[PDB]
Amino acid sequence: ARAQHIVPCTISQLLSATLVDEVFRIGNVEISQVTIVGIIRHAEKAPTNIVYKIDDMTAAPMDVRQWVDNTVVPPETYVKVAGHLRSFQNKKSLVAFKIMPLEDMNEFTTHILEVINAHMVLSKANSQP
């Protein structure tokens, strides 16, 4: 035991994930660490953290929380986020360990492809039942 992937996801997948045996699952794919790509719609600056509303078109924007001790990433910027999926008080959010503005927008197209291929192949590996 046991391999742990950073699974590329859409927000619609994160919002739909349900806790099964204490771990989040979308379809039969387990997710804990994930990546998303979307556009910053809002940035909420506090002294200990920044909370971004990040939008990938697939659902309403998701809350993404980043720990402070780089400045706030400006709104209307595409970013790749890597983070841990949380649901505190039945409200889904990401806790980001990486937030990187995109300089090459082909990375955004590649993420779409990666989401679909990762979920296709991980679901097949897990099924089985």
Binding site: S12, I39, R41, M57, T58, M105, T109, I112
Partner: protein, 117 residues
């Protein structure tokens, strides 16, 4: 509304007729801006045009690859509620490849869900 809180389908121009009155996200290259500034044309990764309408005139020039969020109108144009120009100052955006992504999204909805499922 403020489709920023709704699921928006990523489409190309050949899909416009099938998405009438639906929230959409259209990526394409800026072909031209109407004299009024309240309409522009984007060509998709198959080289097909979509007409983008605005309620207010543009407050800036746009060019290159532009991504529009809006609702498909009765006339299969898009009433745009927001847009982002894609930065290409170091790397040209492959719109043909994006178009393939769009076809894949629509062929595999189980792996790229629209909205909560």
């Amino acid at each position: 509304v403020d489709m920023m809180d709704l699921p928006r389908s990523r489409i190309n121009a050949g899909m416009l007729a099938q998405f009438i009155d639906k929230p959409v996200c259209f990526v394409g290259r800026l072909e031209k801006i109407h004299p009024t500034g309240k309409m522009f044309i984007l060509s998709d990764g198959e080289g097909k045009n979509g007409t983008i309408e605005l309620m207010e005139p543009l407050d800036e020039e746009i060019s290159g690859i532009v991504e529009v969020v809006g609702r498909v109108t009765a006339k299969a144009t898009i009433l745009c509620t927001s847009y982002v120009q894609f930065k290409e100052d170091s790397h040209p955006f492959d719109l043909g490849l994006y178009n393939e992504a769009v076809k894949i999204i629509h062929d595999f909805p189980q792996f790229y869900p629209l909205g909560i499922v």
